[PDB]
């Protein structure tokens, strides 16, 4: 159970880490000059 | 325990996987030509 | 231990409910008619 | 075990808390008079 709750967080962080990859999308939709 | 944290895991992913379809709102507000 | 990781998971939700609340601030300065 | 997951989710708040540091760079794209 333990090391299946732990590779459920490294799904949750790698969930984060594309989130993070369309915040870094919307910063880039809102722009460089 | 294990297998209660686990299914609180599966209701993390499924507020992410919300998160993920206003993410996709917010980019579709900032749009299509 | 694991009613202490259960209680982490009920900091996370209750994080991922404040980002809830930033998403719908940005989706209402992205507006009403 | 526990205290690794638990040392995870403390890895996932620590993301959280970069999401709202992005956040808090999109509220303020989207800003002040």
Same mark, same amino acid.
């Given at each position: /159970?333990? %090391?299946?709750? $732990?590779? %459920? !967080? $490294? $799904?949750?962080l790698? %969930? *984060?880490?594309?989130?993070?990859? #369309? *915040?870094? /999308?919307? %910063?880039? !939709? *809102?722009? #460089? /000059?």
């Amino acid at each position: /159970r333990m %090391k299946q709750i $732990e590779d %459920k !967080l $490294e $799904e949750i962080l790698x %969930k *984060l880490y594309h989130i993070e990859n #369309e *915040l870094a /999308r919307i %910063k880039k !939709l *809102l722009x #460089e /000059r």
